[PDB]
Design a protein around this motif. Sequence first.
Motif, PDB file in Angstrom:
ATOM      1  N   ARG B 156       0.687  -1.313   0.008  1.00  0.00           N
ATOM      2  CA  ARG B 156       0.108  -0.050   0.057  1.00  0.00           C
ATOM      3  C   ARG B 156       0.800   1.147   0.019  1.00  0.00           C
ATOM      4  O   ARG B 156       0.710   2.142  -0.793  1.00  0.00           O
ATOM      5  N   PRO B 160       0.095   3.014  -3.602  1.00  0.00           N
ATOM      6  CA  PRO B 160      -1.131   3.374  -2.920  1.00  0.00           C
ATOM      7  C   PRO B 160      -2.387   3.321  -3.764  1.00  0.00           C
ATOM      8  O   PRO B 160      -3.511   3.187  -3.185  1.00  0.00           O
ATOM      9  N   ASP B 161      -2.317   3.441  -5.140  1.00  0.00           N
ATOM     10  CA  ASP B 161      -3.481   3.526  -6.147  1.00  0.00           C
ATOM     11  C   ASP B 161      -3.819   2.189  -6.691  1.00  0.00           C
ATOM     12  O   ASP B 161      -4.616   2.014  -7.622  1.00  0.00           O
ATOM     13  N   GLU B 194      -7.813  -1.840   6.745  1.00  0.00           N
ATOM     14  CA  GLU B 194      -7.319  -0.495   6.437  1.00  0.00           C
ATOM     15  C   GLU B 194      -6.677  -0.761   5.007  1.00  0.00           C
ATOM     16  O   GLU B 194      -6.691   0.432   4.299  1.00  0.00           O
ATOM     17  N   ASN B 195      -6.063  -1.686   4.703  1.00  0.00           N
ATOM     18  CA  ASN B 195      -5.139  -1.799   3.705  1.00  0.00           C
ATOM     19  C   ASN B 195      -5.616  -2.597   2.350  1.00  0.00           C
ATOM     20  O   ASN B 195      -4.759  -2.685   1.334  1.00  0.00           O
TER      21      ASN B 195
HETATM   22  N1  LIG Z   1      -6.445   1.403   1.767  1.00  0.00           N
HETATM   23  C1  LIG Z   1      -6.480   2.584   2.184  1.00  0.00           C
HETATM   24  N2  LIG Z   1      -7.131   3.360   1.014  1.00  0.00           N
HETATM   25  C2  LIG Z   1      -7.402   4.647   1.308  1.00  0.00           C
HETATM   26  N3  LIG Z   1      -7.578   5.466   0.206  1.00  0.00           N
HETATM   27  C3  LIG Z   1      -7.708   6.972  -0.213  1.00  0.00           C
HETATM   28  C4  LIG Z   1      -6.875   7.395  -1.249  1.00  0.00           C
HETATM   29  C5  LIG Z   1      -7.170   8.555  -1.899  1.00  0.00           C
HETATM   30  C6  LIG Z   1      -6.287   9.067  -2.816  1.00  0.00           C
HETATM   31  C7  LIG Z   1      -5.283   8.394  -3.510  1.00  0.00           C
HETATM   32  C8  LIG Z   1      -5.190   7.286  -3.024  1.00  0.00           C
HETATM   33  C9  LIG Z   1      -5.775   6.555  -1.957  1.00  0.00           C
HETATM   34  O1  LIG Z   1      -3.868   6.424  -3.649  1.00  0.00           O
HETATM   35  C10 LIG Z   1      -3.506   7.398  -4.173  1.00  0.00           C
HETATM   36  O2  LIG Z   1      -4.329   8.461  -4.206  1.00  0.00           O
HETATM   37  C11 LIG Z   1      -7.134   5.175   2.659  1.00  0.00           C
HETATM   38  C12 LIG Z   1      -6.668   4.249   3.523  1.00  0.00           C
HETATM   39  C13 LIG Z   1      -6.658   4.789   5.063  1.00  0.00           C
HETATM   40  C14 LIG Z   1      -7.087   3.799   5.939  1.00  0.00           C
HETATM   41  C15 LIG Z   1      -6.746   3.951   7.200  1.00  0.00           C
HETATM   42  C16 LIG Z   1      -6.733   5.059   7.940  1.00  0.00           C
HETATM   43  C17 LIG Z   1      -6.088   6.250   7.111  1.00  0.00           C
HETATM   44  N4  LIG Z   1      -5.561   7.266   7.360  1.00  0.00           N
HETATM   45  C18 LIG Z   1      -5.440   8.102   6.124  1.00  0.00           C
HETATM   46  C19 LIG Z   1      -5.713   7.087   5.112  1.00  0.00           C
HETATM   47  C20 LIG Z   1      -6.054   5.883   5.515  1.00  0.00           C
HETATM   48  N5  LIG Z   1      -6.526   2.922   3.447  1.00  0.00           N
END
Ligand code: A1L2T
Lengths: 59, 422
Positions: B156, B160-161, B194-195
């Motif tokens: 992640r 992340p995307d 979360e992930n």
């Molecule tokens: N798995 C995953 N995905 C997320 N997506 C958002 C996202 C937006 C724009 C993007 C992107 C991702 O990737 C590149 O552009 C958030 C989280 C999270 C979880 C738990 C606590 C957290 N505190 C901050 C965040 C988070 N966990």
Amino acid sequence: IQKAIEENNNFIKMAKEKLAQKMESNKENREAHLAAMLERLQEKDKHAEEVRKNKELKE
Amino acid sequence: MREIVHIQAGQCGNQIGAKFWEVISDEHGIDPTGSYHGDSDLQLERINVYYNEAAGNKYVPRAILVDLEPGTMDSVRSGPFGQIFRPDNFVFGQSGAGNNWAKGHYTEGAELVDSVLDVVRKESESCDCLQGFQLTHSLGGGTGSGMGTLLISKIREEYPDRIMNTFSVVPSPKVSDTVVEPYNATLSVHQLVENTDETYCIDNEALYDICFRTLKLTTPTYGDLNHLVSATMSGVTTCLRFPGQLNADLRKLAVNMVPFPRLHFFMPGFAPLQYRALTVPELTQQMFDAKNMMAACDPRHGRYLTVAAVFRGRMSMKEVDEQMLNVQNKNSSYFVEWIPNNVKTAVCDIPPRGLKMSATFIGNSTAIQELFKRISEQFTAMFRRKAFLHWYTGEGMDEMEFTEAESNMNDLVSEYQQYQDA
Ligand SMILES: Nc1nc(NCc2ccc3c(c2)OCO3)cc(-c2cccc3[nH]ccc23)n1
Ligand SMILES: Nc1nc2c(ncn2[C@@H]2O[C@H](COP(=O)(O)OP(=O)(O)O)[C@@H](O)[C@H]2O)c(=O)[nH]1
Ligand SMILES: Nc1nc(NCc2ccc3c(c2)OCO3)cc(-c2cccc3[nH]ccc23)n1
Ligand SMILES: [Ca+2]
Ligand SMILES: [Mg+2]
């Protein structure tokens, strides 16, 4: 991971210091017991000399 | 080129991973040496999703094999398809994790995680267009659970995307290796919450009840459970592995299946579980039957947020539509009224080995809360007395982290309940 390392080291440290304190305290106690016994025997040798003198100065 | 990278971690993860690769390699006509000996270009038409093309006109799974002990990877290499895996993709330590999530996640596992990520990066770098990742692992042990969720967190952070998908074997006291499994499972679910984008909850309780009650196997082995797991996973990856009408990638599937980011835990099912050909009514009725579900949860105790049904074999699409509509219309109260058209159907012409007709079920149901409640109760029963905690605090974890994991999972349960009563 740092907390785990620290706890292992503290266990080693505390066991090392406890063991060393025990072994020192034991050495001191044992030596004191033997020194007291010898001192009583030396008091006996002193008393035996005073006896042999008393006997000499009786004559 | 829509490449997927596969990761299998620990004993459970690597055994079920291996079955997955042997089963899909058979479907694509790839033999243990990595040579194609099939009869149909459709088998090769989307082969690059899971397989790299090598020089010797070899197809090599895009697969990374991880454990903290060697045993299971020697068993993989000796297994029937063991020569097909890339030797450099075997990444193993020596210490083991002793069924200890803290060893997997914080101490023993951290030492190995960088070398695992290097291989992930080498595979991704040569991807035309990486769509994302699938991980196979159990949650009850130490390596798949603790190191697997560590890997997931690092992936992640660096991708992340990209979509992160797991097939996650959930522990049950009915099929148990150690008493600490609920701790390892509770700590892991929080990470998945979360992930990951999608987590298939594969419950060893349910797999056991299926082998015992339905398949009439008096003493079921791990091999018997993993046969069901591999057939399910084959079913669930069919819609992207073979040619057909759908232009999908893991992200479009996720977007269609996951209405709220934390509620991404799916019940899988399979039908049929014998020579009598199965009619479409029979496949449809059985795939929705509790007894075919692999996350021992009663779907009548909750509601479906979303459902995907994948049918394999030659059959009438008309008849499929009619039966799927019948089950939705006659059982409408178990499907949330506020997500219209929340049941989606795929058909692949190519059946699995041996069966003429089959169906795989993926449900995003609020009834999955029952599984988490189960685990939470076992967790609490120990954690209220701090039993077996010294195994974890000795690796540096604080009680506080357990309290937080327990709270996260009770919150997940409360969220599922909020949407079940809506
Ligand atoms: N798995 C995953 N995905 C997320 N997506 C958002 C996202 C937006 C724009 C993007 C992107 C991702 O990737 C590149 O552009 C958030 C989280 C999270 C979880 C738990 C606590 C957290 N505190 C901050 C965040 C988070 N966990
Ligand atoms: N379904 C299934 N479950 C397994 C298998 N091997 C181990 N398990 C389960 O996984 C948990 C033990 O985790 P394991 O994979 O052995 O630990 P790890 O290898 O250190 O990550 C227990 O709940 C076992 O019931 C398997 O081959 N199939
Ligand atoms: N979410 C979701 N659904 C699936 N089922 C079929 C389906 C067909 C048509 C649909 C649909 C879903 O939703 C919109 O239209 C499979 C998967 C999957 C997961 C993990 C790894 C995977 N490798 C290939 C596939 C896949 N993931
Ligand atoms: Ca070490
Ligand atoms: Mg084990």
